[PDB]
Design a protein around this ligand. Structure first.
Ligand code: NA
Lengths: 69, 1134
């Protein structure tokens, strides 16, 4: 489940996935998710943002990109 | 940037290259361990959850990576060889650790940051204004630097770290700023044996002034200033020490101190100091104190603990409400019934009422005791503790007590299952004590009356291990140490239960206990030493040695404990029990070959008191007051020792138990024994000849001295008997000194020479006063001269410095306005009485009849005694009167020298010495008369009981001129006072400590040096009494109302026809050996005090046993039955 978008995820409702995710670009909100398995953030996130609202990561988060602002 | 909003993340790995990722955690977010292998900034913003916790900079971290933290972290670990820098920009880190691998590590702590623990394992540079609470500098951290000093530094390389600028930790630091004010800092307080309070304080801005206010334990405010009182102050640099006067009341003092400099008046500082000398007397709740007849003399102690209040439903109740106690199945149903009705409220009222006799007396409630349940639960929680404490204060307040003591026996171990206990007892006891102290202080802000808080504590190491001594001690005025039951029949071999010192390695003692307590931080000041008024017993002890440290078999029958009074009555040197002393432990014990008894006596009490003074302890506590001897000897010993004047050692004191050996003929002295109990000091169980000196035994009569059989502490002088060289016509005074070497106590001095008597063969005298205002020739009741040895004829009088018949004293003749009485007085039948006395002198040719000159209101002595010339004239005239009317001697009844009976007769200060010169001259003249007339003439006086009398006459200088003193051991109390008491009692009642008796009066004469054989004990054939006397204890020692209808002085004859069996019941004070009458109906209640046949028997017995010359009574006319006289006479013959 390897994202490159916008604000991708559910609304007022929690929603379960699994497997190794790879949010690979700036500005990508992810919301009311619950991720069994890993979260990757890659050098492709660059100098830009990535928000995570009421998320869960049962596996490993790995921040390899993002800037300071 | 990456935002982690109300999210959950686990482990996080950061290998961001080149410039940092910012990672933020918002709201309820939650992050696992962050592992840093690149550039990063953790931030926690608007965080309600926990966010980040553990962070580690790993060896994969690249050179010059930027790593910064903001937030609240747990463990942060710098473990990265690439010259790591950690920036901490805000927040907190519990433990930051710089690993041995992190070469040239730099840690930058921004100004608001707090690292609680920083651990250094490599030389580290710590920068910035951020704070480190403890830097742990291990060897690898040697030479680390801090721009701002850590709060504390630990670890082996502590002393190698550098701090502060180039100035050195904390910097140039200067100034300021405008200091000036006088501040007072308290250093400490101390007491000494003399009961001085010493206050030491550092006074900054010493301007040669300060003001101290002391509050006594009884509430007296008192002020001291450098101005009025620099005599009591001593200044050094900041050091100033205030020193009170000697002899302050024992217990807790409150003080305030402050300095000034003209106007600029310092902060007032306050505290508590403790004055040595407390005596805590435990008093049992299960005695009915209102009915008790053994008495309580609260002058001998400072504190009275009511033992005990109990715990029911987590509150404090009287012991009658404690079912564990009242329903003990081991006693009888009738025993339980007494327990259920235990008179606690009556008791408590009687005991606080003893304040009248000692106004400084504090009374506390002691809560708990052996087998008292409820403490573990009471202390369990903040609300259980609240009910309890409030309850305790209610008890204290309900009975008007002065404080609270707890005796929990014991926290944690519960005395091994006797009571309920738990591990938490230990902190819980601390909290409970804290609370009580809080509440008592709270209440005192309202009442302005200070309240004590104290405990009783176990002597064992188990006990000290179960409580928080250093923690509880600040809440306590003192700890009462239970330095008794140290050993007991539970031990397989005998030892001492309450010894002062440990004589062998496994014997516990007061000293072992006090050393244990001092070794745990408890101050000496706050330690009361315990003593016991009971023994511990072992049965079936092997019959070896002295019984001490010997094996014991079965304790099945054993009483366990025997109270001291019972030991005195039936064991100590009685019934085959030998008294022994352990001179290393300083403790006595008994052994009979099978039973061993360890106990506390007069000697162990003195060693214990001396230990207390020597170690500057708080005082002496004992369990329990009611177990003492009849005389309260243990209580009295304790008081004497702790209140002894520094610089004067105590003298050995004696009394007499057997003071007469009587000649069988003019020259044959039978064998006999004098016995003298010690009143102060304790004989060695076995004395030696050199420990006692006896003088006055006739030449060629041998004697030995030994300890008296069947007495605990008395000398026996065994007179062998034999043939005295010449006839013995008068008594021989025998004097016994008990030397310092006789006693167990260390630094006493010799007793005064005690007087006892060898009586000549006719025995004691029996002297009757015969009133001259009775016409004896015509009186149907006659004088029986076979029952008297002596008569005093009352009276001749003094007119114009000449001795005259009583009809020539116009003051007396006209005393009453009755013209009948005046005529009868003018015609007083003296000549007829003198012919009558002469006929007496035929049917008892050995009778002596003396003329008494003087009596009540009789004038002329002070004038007669004034110069050699007036003495001469009075003496010559008294002698002419003596011969003219056929008298065999002269008695002088001067009532009274110096004080004149408070203005009834003329008096002067000079009467004191002139009385001595008067008697001396009278004895000289009567020697002359005797040597002219072929016979011996007596000279005697009548003398009074009051200390003012004793002080107004030179008793030790006058006895030599006198055949005897007829001491008026009567009129002690009467209508001039409002409270009832015995007017003539032979002993002082147990219920009126310090009161008058024959015993007390005749002892005081002896302590002035008068020989026993020059004393005559006085009986009164009349009564005194009071009206409006409450019907409580049949009127005895009761406050009485208006005395306008007082019965005055009825004679025994009046008693017979008007009082006996007329609504009066006869009672008996057995301790006083005195009768009294009560009639609830007569005049608001009427109480009568008199002598009867029984009391006169005992006066007579007293005379015989004390070696007195005899007995006298006033007067023959007052008992026409002959029974009062017959009682004396039969006992003196017996
Ligand atoms: Na946190």
């Amino acid at each position: 489940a390897y994202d490159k978008a916008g604000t991708y995820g559910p609304a007022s409702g929690t929603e379960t996935i699994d497997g190794n995710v790879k949010v690979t670009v700036p500005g990508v909100t992810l919301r009311n998710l619950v991720i069994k398995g890993d979260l990757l953030l890659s050098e492709g996130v660059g100098s830009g943002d990535v928000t995570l609202d009421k998320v869960s990561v049962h596996g490993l988060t790995t921040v390899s990109g993002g800037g300071e602002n | 940037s990456v935002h982690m909003n109300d999210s959950v993340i686990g482990v996080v790995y950061v290998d961001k290259k080149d410039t940092p990722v910012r990672i933020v955690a918002k709201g309820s977010a939650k992050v696992g361990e962050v592992i840093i292998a690149g550039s990063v900034k953790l931030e926690e913003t608007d965080l309600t959850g926990t966010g980040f916790e553990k962070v580690v900079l790993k060896d994969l971290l690249p050179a010059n990576a930027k790593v910064t933290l903001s937030g609240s972290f747990t463990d942060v670990d710098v473990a990265a060889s690439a010259n790591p820098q950690l920036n901490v920009n805000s927040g907190t880190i519990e433990r930051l650790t710089v690993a041995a691998s992190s070469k040239d590590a730099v840690i930058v702590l921004a100004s608001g940051v707090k690292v609680t623990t920083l651990t250094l394992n490599i030389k580290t540079q710590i920068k910035g204004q951020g704070s480190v609470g403890t830097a742990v500098v291990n060897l690898g951290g040697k030479g680390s630097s801090f721009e701002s000093a850590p709060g504390k530094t630990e670890g082996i390389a502590k002393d190698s770290v550098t701090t502060g600028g180039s100035f050195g930790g904390g910097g140039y630091g200067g100034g300021s700023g405008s200091s000036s004010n006088p501040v007072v800092k308290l250093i400490s307080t101390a007491s000494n044996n003399d009961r001085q309070l010493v206050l030491k304080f550092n006074a900054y801005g010493w301007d040669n002034n300060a003001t101290i206010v002391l509050t006594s334990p009884a509430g007296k405010q008192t002020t001291y200033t450098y101005e009025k009182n620099s005599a009591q102050f001593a200044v050094s640099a900041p050091e100033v020490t205030f020193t009170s006067d000697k002899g302050l009341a024992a217990g807790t003092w409150l003080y305030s101190v402050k300095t000034a400099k003209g106007s600029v008046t310092s902060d007032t500082v306050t505290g508590k100091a403790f004055v040595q000398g407390k005596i805590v007397s435990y008093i049992p709740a299960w005695v009915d104190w209102a009915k008790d007849e053994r008495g309580v003399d609260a002058t001998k102690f400072t504190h009275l603990y009511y033992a005990f209040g109990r715990i029911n439903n987590g509150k404090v109740v009287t012991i009658k409400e404690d079912a564990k106690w009242t329903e003990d199945p081991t006693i009888t149903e009738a025993d339980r019934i007494k327990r259920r009705n235990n008179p606690d409220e009556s008791n408590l009222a009687y005991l606080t009422g003893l304040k009248a006799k000692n106004p400084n007396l504090k009374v506390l409630v002691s809560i708990g005791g052996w087998e008292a349940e409820g403490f573990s639960d009471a202390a369990l929680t903040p609300e259980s503790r609240e009910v309890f404490a409030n309850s305790a204060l209610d008890f204290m307040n309900k009975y008007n007590l002065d404080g609270i003591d707890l005796d929990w026996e014991y926290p944690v171990y519960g005395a091994w299952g006797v009571i309920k206990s738990r591990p938490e007892d230990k902190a819980n006891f601390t909290a409970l004590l804290k609370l009580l102290r809080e509440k008592l202080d709270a209440q005192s802000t309202t009442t302005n009356k200070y309240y004590e808080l104290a405990i009783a504590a176990g002597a064992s190491k188990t006990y000290t291990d179960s409580v928080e001594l250093t923690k509880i001690t600040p809440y306590l005025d003192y700890i009462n140490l239970m330095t008794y039951d140290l050993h007991g029949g539970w031990d397989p071999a005998t030892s001492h239960h309450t010894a002062v010192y440990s004589a062998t390695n496994n014997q516990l003692s007061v000293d072992s206990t006090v050393k244990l307590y001092l070794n745990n931080g408890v101050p000496a000041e706050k330690l009361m030493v315990g003593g016991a008024f009971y023994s511990r017993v072992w049965q079936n002890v092997e019959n070896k040695g002295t019984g001490l440290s010997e094996k014991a078999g079965s304790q099945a029958g054993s009483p366990g404990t025997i109270v001291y009074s019972e030991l005195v009555n039936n064991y100590i040197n009685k019934n085959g029990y030998t008294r022994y002393w352990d001179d290393t432990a300083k403790a006595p014990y008994l052994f009979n070959g099978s039973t061993f008894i360890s106990y506390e006596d007069t000697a162990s009490a003195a060693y214990k008191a001396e230990y207390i003074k020597q170690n500057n302890l708080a005082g002496f506590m004992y369990w329990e007051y009611s177990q003492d001897s009849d005389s309260h000897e243990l209580a009295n010993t304790i008081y004497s020792r702790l209140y002894a004047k520094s610089g004067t050692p105590l003298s050995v004191g004696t009394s007499v138990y057997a003071g007469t050996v009587t000649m069988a003929t003019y020259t044959q002295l039978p064998a006999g024994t004098f016995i003298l109990p010690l009143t102060q000091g304790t004989l060695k169980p076995v004395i030696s000849a050199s420990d006692v000196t006896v003088s006055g035994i006739p030449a060629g009569i041998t004697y030995t001295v030994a300890n008296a059989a069947d007495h605990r502490n008395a000398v026996a002088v065994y007179v062998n008997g034999g043939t005295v060289a010449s006839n013995v016509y008068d008594p021989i005074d025998v004097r016994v000194v008990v030397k310092a070497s006789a006693v167990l106590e260390a630094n006493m001095t010799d007793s005064a020479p005690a007087s006892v008597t060898i009586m000549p063969k006719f025995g004691p005298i029996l002297l009757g006063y015969v009133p001259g205002w009775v016409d004896w020739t015509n009186s149907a009741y006659k004088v029986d001269a076979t029952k008297l040895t002596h008569i005093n004829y009352a009276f001749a009088r003094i007119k114009d410095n000449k001795v005259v018949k009583i009809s020539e004293d116009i003051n007396w003749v006209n005393e009453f306005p009755s013209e009948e009485i005046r005529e009868q007085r003018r015609n007083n039948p003296d000549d007829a009485n003198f012919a009558y006395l002469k006929t007496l002198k035929q049917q008892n040719p050995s009778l002596k009849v003396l003329v008494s000159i003087g009596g009540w209101a009789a004038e002329g002595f002070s004038d007669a005694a004034l110069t050699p010339e007036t003495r001469e004239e009075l003496a010559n005239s008294a002698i002419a009167f003596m011969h003219q009317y056929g008298f065999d001697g002269i008695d002088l009844d001067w009532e009274y020298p110096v004080y004149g009976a408070f203005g009834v007769i003329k008096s002067r200060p000079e009467d004191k010495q002139n009385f001595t010169a008067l008697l001396k001259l009278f004895r000289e003249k009567l020697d002359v008369e005797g040597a002219l007339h072929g016979k011996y003439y007596e000279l005697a006086i009548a003398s009074a009981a009051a200390p003012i009398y004793i002080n107004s006459v030179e008793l030790d200088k006058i006895h030599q001129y006198l055949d005897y003193m007829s001491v008026m051991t009567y009129d002690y109390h009467g209508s001039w006072e409002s409270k009832t008491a015995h007017q003539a009692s032979v002993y002082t009642s147990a219920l009126s400590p310090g009161d008058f008796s024959a015993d007390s009066v005749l002892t005081a004469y002896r302590k002035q040096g008068v020989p026993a054989s020059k004393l005559v004990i006085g009986g009164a054939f009349y009564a005194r009494g009071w009206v409006n006397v409450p019907n409580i204890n049949h009127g005895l020692f009761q406050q009485a109302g208006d005395q306008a209808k007082n019965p005055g002085t009825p004679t025994y004859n009046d008693l017979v026809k008007d009082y006996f069996d007329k609504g009066y019941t006869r009672y008996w004070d057995n301790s006083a050996k005195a009768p009294y009458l009560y009639n609830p109906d007569a005049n608001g209640g009427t109480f009568i005090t008199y002598d009867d046949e029984e009391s006169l028997k005992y006066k007579a017995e007293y005379a015989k046993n004390q070696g007195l010359r005899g007995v006298m009574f006033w007067d023959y006319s007052q008992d026409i039955s002959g029974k009062l006289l017959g009682a004396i006479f039969n006992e003196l013959k017996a």
